């Protein structure tokens, strides 16, 4: 009853230290669906799905290209992450203008965090309503990151974000003992099961709301839709119930 | 345990508790009193139909340009606050021009979509459009159908529906749509699903087509020829 | 704004400042002397801003 | 009824500004001020607010010189005050180097008048809570302003300012004169501010300047004590 | 930008029915929240500034707690009030008298170096986005023809000179006290005016002193060079005071 | 603030306001708005009826849901078997309006549903009442409410994004003997607008009612959230109106293949 | 009408009755909250209008296991018959063109009714404030030409503040909600009431509420005089929202 | 009310509460009258500033010249009236410097009116409250007579008042006023005798006259004495008129 | 309660204070026109006359350029604003090309002039609305009409201001091929849709007329009294 004064501007702080247009900005990243990231000792690997609409309305392209190395998946706003994608593209190409050599992906990240960071703190402004899932390979090897609209960043080995992904975020912790010994099939058919956890228990994944994104240590960043993506779903067996 | 007032619709950088921009979700409302537009995509050609509505007879029927054609073999459709296009408009032309001027070939559907896309995402003029476009045209990729809302943000397609009654239109289009037809089927059937749209008769003086295809270049249908249907 | 009788050095400062700022076009030779709490002082100011302290 | 006494750009209903009559209620809780156009001069006088013996008494002073033919004193804020002085003599300087001779009192008044005038039509400001009254000698003939916080300047024989000035210029009513010298005029206007000082007056705690045709100068305090004794 | 608040009291450029800014008012009141109180007095040739140290926590290194600055090589501070806007009036003190000596050749004196502080906090005062900061600050020096000086500026934008002032919590005591000592007496010697300066305070603060609870700064015609006093001295002045 | 220093005022919880600032075209302006909105109920002849909805029929069961999701249940899980008439029609306007239907079963005359899927602002719902119940209340009468609300406007002492949704909650008249099949509400969490309009009117008129509460993470029509309601099935008030489940099953799969599309917005 | 909760009204003769406003921050609500808490009161039935938009929710001063699933709603009348106090509580807010109703009716049901006094708890804007209130206390009443003359003696006693008139003359309470037109109905009707209200800000008006019932104490000595004496209400939690979510700090 | 703070708000009806407010504040200023002649062109004032300690240091009060051939009075705020007479000075002498001949007579009203129109279409600044009365003499329409308001709107009148008391005047003056048959002496007869009902001595009016002679426009303000015979000879014929 | 700011929507889609701007404009006087076959004709009424008033300063028809003219309904600042501004654009383009400018090329630029002021909080919409008629190069009659939002349309013949509506419907009714054939038919057709609303015709209606290769032409009251006559002569003539 008592915060009606003190939730409008990003620049007012609570009696209690809180600041609450940041964690209302941090609820628009559950309007969007789900995806899931993991990493093995090789290769990176991200799966989203798409939203149950029909697809002669809509084309959404979930998981976007960023470098030849790096890609990303989204689960938010469109507008806060076309202007993400762009300055992460722009970085990259400059970066390999000037020094014929590929940007780190923790320099990227910590870029990125530097640059959401300011709209936080200025009048006029709003906070970013996109959560990004980070996959590359460089020098260092495979890595996957999460992006929050606070600014905040984190070095995760799997990780799901989206729409009732705490069924994904279970299954990841509850099965995350094996991703390291496994090779790209298995890897990408545990994304699935994970994926596939945050559906009602009849539904079951097809062809026509499903992306897949991989990288590794000698495949650049590619992406699987529509019809190439059955090779990898053919394997997958039915629901244990 | 008492009940207070709160508001949080009032300005356009404000998020509600549970995540919402409602700002831009009035603007989409207001998409809802413009006049209804179809737009089908096939192999052949891209076939933009679209609806005219006039308060008086002493108005003449020839000033409503709502399919305004922009060079490089695009096409356009537009529906609700027709005085806000124009910027957008220009934008494209000169986008367009600058790259006939300095390439000598034509931009593609894409880049003028992502081109004009980049203008209508500035208000974060201080408040949202109030107007959704349909673009088409053909490539060396194909023909390709493109569809914005006032969020500033574009998105591919193939059958959309846009306007006052466009619920019903869609899902007339999904039955009817398929992956394979003429260009001419095409034609009938947005003429059709205008037919059962409308409230008032079909004469040649109420609709506006523009059929574009790699043939030729753009061809507005002239009276006689809407005539003819 | 002081109160009180200026100084030598700050008239030439000025103007050796202004004179230097365009680059020798003005096109004035001056000989500035006064004399201030610090005593007499006399100096030679040339058309592209440099002096001299010279008795 | 409060609504319109917040903004500085916002129109009454009745068609007034409040924000200028709170300057001027402002400048109105001052120390008073007088001023008398006498024949060949004219007399400033004014009283001090450093009133104990700790304060230094050559560090800061309520009437200053502009040129050598003008002067200056205020009731109000001081601050104000200072910066307004600043503008003034550097407007001097500057018609002095355009026109190669000095400027009038007139083009002066108008001048300032047209700074102040600033700040009272735009938001984000507030306009100066200062009076000035102005003194000079031109072609001749003695000249004496008073200029208001919103801009409006007018032309006087004999005037009060600061608390109690209501008072004071039903004294200089009754006890002003057309064919008056410059020692008279000294006289009354140290009566005329000797009538609301609650205290014991001495030459420390009010100051005086006069302007003739030998230009505006600042009494020293024991020519204020030698005219003090006379009375 | 964000937009004044409505009331007669909650904005900086906004005047009561009476004509009075309740936001400097309110400015002026920050100085107390230290709970500190200093003392400045002027002699003969000598100038000496006294201010009390406040060291509340075992675990806290007392040689980073001050509140003695120099500005330049001659000119000396005490600053009162809230401890960051000291600081930061302080840097842009040592600004200032950098662009006077640049720009005109010679050093700065203290009533100019005064005065342009105090100009600069009057236009806080008139603009909506500023705000005035809650300090006071108190110079002393030596002037090269007119000998010692004293000088202070406060949020309002007023500055003037004195022959001994005070600040903080317990300014009205000292006051009288100060005034009562200068009306019987004048002429001190360099030992005279510590002795004065330390009694004031230790009679306005009914303690008596160790040489770790205050802080002293001096200047002198023969050393015209701001100083400060260490703990030996300090003591020394106390038992002469004490015998 | 729309310009450098503008003077702006504070907003208030109590809405004091509009009140306490207070013309032949004003006052016609303000009976023609008056007219704008208002509610009707009809019988879609178009001929509105004489009294109140309960006051033409006796009625011993009625059951009453709002929203979409509490529709979608209803239509799936108990309105698959038996005949139903409708009865009347309900007609609103606001700027957030959609349908307000009438039914009531041929087999057994005094069962009546509701399935109201608009929006009724605050100055609607007592004229709902009065159209609906009318001055006379019956107390041989039992009344059920479904209703849905999103999980961010629950009160608790952790943070709101940990608590498992959607979860369910209750709300009872004195005169209610049963027990609820879900916790009540605790007490900082309060209900407003319809509900709280029927459930206070029971209350103080002395008829038996029971509110029902689901608080969910997404508030379109999702499948989840439709069977979130499936415990009340079990109840003494739905128990002979539920035949064969599967069937309904897939009534509500069917239905919620069939959805309006978004906006470009939240990809 | 008032309903009651049982099959009969209580009899009411000689009663004084205590009433809010809903006025800015809640603070004459928050200020009958601790009252009714306090002071232990029963229900004894409902006022039922169409003036207040409704709410409902369970019993906001629970101690026990049995009676912690009690309905409440936007209005309610609590007595205490030992002393002769009755008190009537407001949840929820006025719908537009409501409010004249809603006043006319309560004061013919407490013309009715036979209560000899009215006193109501309201508050006011307090950025309109001249220099002359900005240095006085807070706390301001008045007073109706009918009240006994011996109301007005122990006020006079107590050196109280009167609220000032505004420029025939008129009084005017901005922020105050239904305090005027009460006042004005009371006045032209001949009944007995005092207005009791503080300046006050919006934000966590709890102390204004301690305040104000403290102040109301001085003259009714409803308990022990001043020389941990309030209950507050179990419902008085969570007045900030929920918890704090992770990974932020 | 809710649409009366700013200047940049339509009410529900097409209203700007402001403007009409800036308007309110030309009812309390002094009376300013204006008549137009077959030989000229008259303004006549009320002198507010009447005080026994006030000094008379200037050509006029509340009448200012403009250039060769056109003056203006004015009544409202004394400071926006200065800057508004400053800009009139300024535009007339541009419009001579570029064209090289003297600007016609109402387009400089236009261009004052335009800058007026622009402090009441931009936010975050305030209306001026100044009104005026313009006369003067050009080669396209000849003697001429013009009014201007705060909200940026003007006309040409042949008789017109505005200040305390317009309402009754320009009653007085409809009653009165005989077109195309007044020269100047009729004129200052009229303005003595509307003057003198709205309100009378020779210190509390001032009276300017223009007029053309040997193809040069000539500006004057009455003296003392002219004031005197002109207020004696209105008392002596009305009590003629009034002794019968 | 979202009416207060320019750039603020409503829930169900509305900007109120162009609404308002337009409410502003439906309080102006009427104001009618009609293109024929060869001749375009204007008409504005009087709202009140003045007797001590100069009537050529308060005109509500002007000149845009040769082939061009305008009548405008609302405030009246804001139309002098904006004549000023088209007149100095004409100039410039002419100046730059010496073609003639179009009837199409200067109303796109008024209502663009006017769709620039509806975009920002610091700035108020103008409250007209403009009526332009003029002939092209190759002599085809035109008639546009603005709005203070900034859209535009082509019409045949149409009404502003207050009492448009049975104007407009009158017009309806009435405008034929059979009543334009000639100059003085479109006129009187003019004239009586004006004299619908009018009190009294001829003392208070203004009109104009503009012809192909010829300058605008402002009728005088002795031809609007002979129009009106022969309008009397006729209707009695029909009385029967």
């Not at chain 2, 004009?116 to 490539?139: H, I, K, T, W, Y």
């Not at chain 3, 400062?13 to 001056?30: D, E, T």
């Not at chain 5, 007496?185 to 603060?205: G, H, M, P, R, Y």
């Not at chain 7, 305090?179 to 009371?186: G, H, V």
Request: hydrophobic content about 40%; aromatic content about 8%; charged content about 25%.
């Amino acid at each position: 009853m008592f915060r009606n004064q003190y939730d409008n501007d990003v620049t007012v702080w609570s009696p209690q230290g809180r600041i609450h247009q940041i964690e209302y900005a941090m609820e628009a990243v559950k309007q969007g669906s789900a995806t899931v990231g993991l990493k093995s000792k090789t290769h990176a690997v991200l799966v989203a799905l798409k939203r149950a609409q029909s697809e002669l309305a809509a084309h959404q392209k979930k998981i976007l290209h960023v470098d030849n190395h790096i890609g990303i998946s989204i689960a938010g706003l469109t507008a806060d992450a076309r202007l993400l994608c762009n300055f992460m593209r722009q970085e990259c190409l400059d970066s390999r203008f000037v020094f014929d050599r590929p940007l780190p992906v923790s320099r990227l990240v910590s870029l990125i965090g530097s640059k959401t960071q300011i709209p936080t703190q200025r009048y006029g402004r709003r906070p970013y309503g996109v959560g990004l899932l980070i996959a590359g390979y460089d020098d260092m090897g495979p890595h996957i990151f999460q992006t929050c609209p606070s600014a905040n960043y984190f070095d995760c080995r799997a990780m799901s974000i989206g729409a009732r992904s705490q069924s994904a975020r279970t299954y990841l912790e509850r099965h995350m003992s094996e991703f390291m010994e496994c090779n790209l099939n298995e890897l990408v058919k545990h994304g699935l099961r994970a994926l596939r956890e945050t559906l009602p228990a009849e539904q079951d994944l097809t062809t026509k709301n499903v992306s897949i994104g991989i990288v590794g240590k000698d495949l650049e960043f590619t992406i699987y839709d529509d019809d190439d993506v059955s090779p990898f779903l053919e394997g997958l067996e039915e629901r244990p119930q | 345990m008492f009940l207070t007032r709160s508001e949080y619709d009032r300005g356009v950088n404000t998020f509600s508790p549970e995540g919402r921009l409602f700002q831009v979700e009035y603007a989409i409302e207001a998409i809802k009193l413009g006049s209804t537009a179809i737009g089908i995509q096939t192999s052949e050609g891209v076939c933009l139909a679209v609806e005219k509505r006039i308060t008086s007879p002493l108005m003449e029927p020839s000033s409503i340009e709502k399919i305004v054609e922009i060079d490089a073999h695009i096409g356009c459709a537009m529906s609700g606050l027709i005085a806000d296009a124009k910027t957008l408009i220009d934008k494209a032309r000169v986008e367009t021009q600058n790259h006939w001027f300095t390439y000598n070939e034509t931009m593609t559907v894409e880049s003028v979509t992502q081109a004009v896309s980049n203008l209508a995402l500035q208000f974060g003029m201080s408040r949202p459009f109030g107007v959704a476009l349909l673009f088409g045209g053909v490539d060396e990729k194909g023909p390709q159908l493109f569809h914005m809302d006032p969020s500033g943000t574009f998105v591919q397609c193939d059958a959309r529906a846009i306007g006052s009654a466009s619920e019903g239109a869609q899902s007339s289009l999904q039955e009817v749509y398929h992956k394979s037809m003429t260009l001419k089927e095409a034609i009938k059937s947005s003429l059709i699903i205008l037919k059962q749209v409308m409230e008032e008769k079909l004469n040649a003086t109420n609709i506006e087509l523009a059929t574009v295809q790699p043939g030729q270049n753009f061809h507005m249908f002239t009276k006689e020829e809407l005539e003819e249907v | 704004s002081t109160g009180r009788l200026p100084r030598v050095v700050t008239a030439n400062r000025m103007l050796k400042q202004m004179l230097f700022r365009y680059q020798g076009y003005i096109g004035a030779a001056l000989v500035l002397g006064g004399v201030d709490v610090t005593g007499p002082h006399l100096y030679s100011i040339y058309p592209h801003g440099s002096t001299d302290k010279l008795p | 009824e409060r609504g319109y006494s917040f903004s500085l750009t916002t129109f009454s209903p009745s068609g007034k500004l409040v924000q200028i009559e709170y300057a001027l209620a402002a400048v109105a809780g001052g120390a008073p001020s007088v001023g008398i156009k006498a024949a060949n001069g004219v007399v400033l006088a004014t009283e001090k607010k450093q009133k104990s013996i700790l304060y230094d008494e050559r560090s800061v002073h309520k009437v200053e010189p502009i040129t050598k033919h003008i002067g200056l004193v205020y009731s109000g804020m001081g601050p104000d005050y200072r910066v307004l002085v600043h503008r003034a003599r550097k407007l001097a300087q500057q018609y002095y180097l355009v026109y190669q001779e000095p400027i009038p009192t007139a083009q002066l008044v108008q001048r300032v008048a047209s700074v102040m005038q600033e700040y009272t039509q735009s938001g984000g400001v507030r306009p100066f809570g200062v009076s000035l009254l102005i003194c000079g000698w031109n072609e001749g003939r003695p000249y004496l302003f008073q200029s208001d916080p919103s801009g409006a300047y007018f032309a006087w024989k004999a005037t009060a300012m600061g608390k109690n000035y209501v008072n004071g210029k039903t004294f200089l009513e009754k006890r002003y004169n057309e064919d008056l010298e410059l020692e008279d005029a000294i006289h009354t206007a140290i009566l005329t501010l000797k009538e609301s000082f609650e205290g014991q007056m001495t030459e420390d705690n009010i100051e005086v300047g006069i302007c003739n045709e030998a230009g505006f100068r600042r009494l020293t305090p024991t020519e204020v004590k030698d005219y003090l004794a006379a009375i | 930008s964000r937009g004044s608040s409505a009331g007669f009291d909650r904005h900086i450029t906004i005047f009561s029915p009476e004509g009075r800014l309740y936001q400097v008012e309110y400015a002026f009141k920050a100085i107390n929240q230290g709970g500190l109180t200093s003392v400045a007095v002027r002699g003969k040739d000598c100038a000496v500034i006294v201010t009390q140290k406040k060291v509340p926590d075992k675990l806290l290194d007392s040689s980073t707690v001050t509140h003695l600055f120099k500005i330049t090589e001659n000119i000396g501070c005490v600053m009162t009030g809230m401890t960051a806007d000291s600081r930061s009036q302080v840097q842009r003190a040592r600004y200032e008298a950098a662009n006077w000596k640049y720009k005109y050749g010679y050093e700065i004196p203290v009533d100019m170096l005064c005065k342009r502080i105090a100009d600069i906090s009057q236009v806080y005062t008139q603009n909506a986005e500023m705000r005035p900061l809650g300090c006071c600050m108190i110079l002393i020096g030596i002037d090269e023809e007119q000998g010692p000086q004293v000088y202070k500026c406060d949020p309002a934008g007023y500055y003037c000179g004195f022959k001994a002032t005070a600040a903080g919590v317990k300014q009205t005591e000292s006051t009288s006290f100060l005034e009562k000592k200068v009306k019987k007496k004048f002429d001190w010697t360099f030992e005279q005016t510590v002795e004065t300066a330390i009694t004031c305070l230790s009679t306005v603060l009914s303690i008596d002193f160790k040489p770790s609870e205050i802080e002293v700064g001096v200047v002198t015609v023969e050393n015209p060079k701001f100083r400060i006093l260490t703990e030996a001295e300090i003591d020394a002045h106390l038992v002469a005071l004490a015998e | 603030a729309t310009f450098f220093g503008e003077v702006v005022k504070a907003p208030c919880r109590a809405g004091t306001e509009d009140e306490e600032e207070e013309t032949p075209e004003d006052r016609e302006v303000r009976l023609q708005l008056a007219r704008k909105r208002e509610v009707r109920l009809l019988r879609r002849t178009k001929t509105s009826l004489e009294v109140s909805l309960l006051e033409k029929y006796p009625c011993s069961k009625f059951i009453i849901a709002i929203g979409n999701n509490a529709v979608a249940f209803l239509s799936s899980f108990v309105m698959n078997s038996g005949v139903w008439e409708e009865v009347g029609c309900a007609k609103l306007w606001n700027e957030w309006c959609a349908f307000c239907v009438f039914y009531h079963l041929k087999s057994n005359p005094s069962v009546f549903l509701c399935q109201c899927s608009c929006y009724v602002a605050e100055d609607q719902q007592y004229q709902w009442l009065e159209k609906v119940f009318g001055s006379c209340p019956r107390k041989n009468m039992q009344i059920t409410i479904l209703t849905c609300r999103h999980v961010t406007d629950y009160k608790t002492s952790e943070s709101t994004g940990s608590l498992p949704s959607p979860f369910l909650r209750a709300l009872k008249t004195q005169n209610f003997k049963d027990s609820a099949c879900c916790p009540l509400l605790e007490q900082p969490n309060i209900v407003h607008d319809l509900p709280a309009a029927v459930l206070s009117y029971c209350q103080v008129w002395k008829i038996p009612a029971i509110l029902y509460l689901c608080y969910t993470d997404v508030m379109k029509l999702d499948l989840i959230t439709v069977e979130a309601f499936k415990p009340i099935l079990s109840t003494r008030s739905l128990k002979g109106l539920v035949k064969n489940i599967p069937q309904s099953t897939e009534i509500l799969k069917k239905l919620m293949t069939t959805n309006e599309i978004q906006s470009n917005i939240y990809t | 009408m008032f309903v009651p909760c049982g099959e009969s009204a209580p009899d009411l003769a000689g009663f004084t009755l205590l009433m809010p406003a809903v006025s800015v921050g809640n603070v004459g609500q928050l200020a009958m909250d601790l009252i009714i808490s306090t002071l232990n009161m029963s229900k004894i039935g409902y006022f039922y209008t169409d003036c207040l938009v409704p709410m409902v929710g369970n019993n906001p001063y629970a101690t026990t296991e049995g009676n912690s699933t009690e309905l409440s709603i936007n209005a309610e009348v609590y007595s205490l018959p030992s002393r002769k106090l009755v008190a009537l509580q407001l949840r929820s807010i006025f719908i537009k063109y409501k409010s004249k109703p809603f006043c006319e009716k309560l004061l013919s049901w407490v013309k009715s009714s036979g209560c000899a006094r009215v006193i109501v708890l309201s508050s006011s804007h307090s950025y309109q404030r001249n220099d002359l209130q900005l240095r006085s206390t807070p706390f301001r009443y008045l007073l109706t030409p009918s009240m006994q003359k011996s109301v007005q003696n122990k006020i006079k006693s107590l050196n109280w503040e009167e609220m000032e008139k505004s420029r025939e003359f008129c009084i005017r309470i901005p922020g105050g909600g239904i305090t005027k037109t009460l006042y004005d109905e009371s006045c032209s009707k001949e009944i007995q009431m005092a207005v009791l209200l503080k300046f006050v800000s919006e934000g966590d008006n709890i102390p204004d509420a301690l305040g104000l019932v403290e102040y109301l104490n001085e003259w009714l000595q409803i308990l022990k005089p001043l020389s941990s004496r309030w209950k507050i209400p179990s419902s008085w939690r969570l007045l900030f929202g929920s918890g704090l979510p992770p990974a932020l700090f | 009310r809710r649409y009366d703070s700013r200047t940049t708000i339509f009410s529900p009806e097409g209203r700007l509460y402001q403007v009409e407010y800036a308007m309110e504040a030309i009812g309390h200023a002094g009376t300013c009258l204006g008549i137009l002649a077959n030989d000229g062109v008259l303004l006549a004032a009320e002198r507010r500033n009447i005080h026994k300690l006030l000094d008379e240091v200037f050509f006029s009060e509340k009448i200012y010249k403009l250039n060769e051939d056109m003056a203006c009075s004015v009544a409202g705020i004394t400071s926006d009236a200065n800057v508004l007479t400053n800009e009139l000075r300024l535009i007339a002498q541009r419009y001579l410097l570029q064209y090289q001949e003297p600007i016609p007579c109402e387009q400089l009203v236009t261009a004052l009116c335009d800058i007026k129109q622009a402090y009441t279409q931009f936010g975050g600044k305030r209306p001026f409250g100044v009104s005026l009365l313009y006369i003067g003499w050009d080669k396209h329409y000849g003697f001429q007579l013009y009014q201007s308001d705060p909200s940026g709107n003007y006309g040409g009148w042949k008789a017109t008042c505005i200040g305390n008391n317009s309402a009754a005047a320009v009653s007085m003056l409809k009653q009165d006023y005989k077109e195309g048959e007044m020269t100047l002496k009729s004129a200052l007869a009229l303005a003595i005798k509307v003057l003198n009902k709205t309100m009378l001595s020779a210190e509390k009016v001032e009276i300017a006259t223009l007029t053309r002679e040997n193809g040069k426009t000539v500006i004057r303000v009455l003296k003392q004495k002219e004031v005197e015979q002109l207020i004696k000879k209105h008392e002596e014929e009305e009590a003629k008129a009034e002794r019968e | 309660s979202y009416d207060r700011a320019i750039t603020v929507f409503s829930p169900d889609g509305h900007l109120f204070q162009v609404e308002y701007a337009q409410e502003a404009v439906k309080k102006g006087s009427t104001a009618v026109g009609v293109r024929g076959r060869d001749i375009v004709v204007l008409g504005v009424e009087k709202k009140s006359v003045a007797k001590l008033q100069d009537e050529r300063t308060v005109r509500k028809i002007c000149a845009l350029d040769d082939n061009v003219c305008m009548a405008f309904a609302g405030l009246t600042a804001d139309a002098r604003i904006v004549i000023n501004r088209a007149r100095v654009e004409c100039q410039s383009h002419r100046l730059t090309v010496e073609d003639p400018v179009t009837v199409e090329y200067i109303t796109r630029y008024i209502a663009s002039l006017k769709q620039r002021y509806t975009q920002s909080n610091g700035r108020r919409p103008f409250g007209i609305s403009a009526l332009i008629v003029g002939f092209d190069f190759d002599g085809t009659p035109r008639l546009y009409q603005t709005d203070p939002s900034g859209t535009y349309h082509a019409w045949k013949a149409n009404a502003i201001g207050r009492g448009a509506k049975s104007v407009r419907e009158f017009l309806e009714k009435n405008y034929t091929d059979e009543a334009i054939e000639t100059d003085d038919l479109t006129i009187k057709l003019v004239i009586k849709a004006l004299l619908e609303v009018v009190q009294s015709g001829g003392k208070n209606i203004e009109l104009a007329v503009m012809r192909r290769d010829q300058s605008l032409k402002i009728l005088n009251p002795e031809e609007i009294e002979k129009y009106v006559a022969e309008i009397e002569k006729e209707k009695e003539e029909n009385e029967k």
